[PDB]
Write a protein that binds this ligand. Sequence first.
Ligand code: W8A
Length: 167
Amino acid sequence: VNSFSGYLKLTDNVYIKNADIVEEAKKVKPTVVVNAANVYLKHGGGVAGALNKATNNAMQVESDDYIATNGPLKVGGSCVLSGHNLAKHCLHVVGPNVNKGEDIQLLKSAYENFNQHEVLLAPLLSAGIFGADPIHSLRVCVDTVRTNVYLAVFDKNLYDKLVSSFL
Ligand SMILES: C[C@H](SCC(=O)O)C(=O)N1CCNC1=O
């Protein structure tokens, strides 16, 4: 049994809800919240901007030290950092950004990072300002992630479209 409430069950392991990921993280304090990161961990907008703002910029400070030591992530890659006030840990995952011309086949590699964690609160990777089709992102999620993933869809209109179109 876990703390997550009000989710629709899509599959054995994937759940979805119309929710503000910061507000959901603040309520649940999950072991892992996933950030929609870029390779530079520059948390300017979308999920990264929101999450970072909710940490009062502590996520960005920690991220800048990580990059100064380790250099950029790979597209499709991830790192584990603090969850600050939102979660125990934040898994920063880099999905391909279609608005930068990155290969969408890298979306499956991105979701494979979730399999290193038994339970996660996450957004749909590569959706929103990353330019990919959220319907596609949900399909790749379901077909890739085997651990228990609780997806927070920001937009109610999009949430309803994702549920109604789910095969
Ligand atoms: C990846 C999403 S796109 C819209 C969606 O999930 O419907 C995004 O930009 N944001 C901002 C805050 N929470 C989010 O998920």
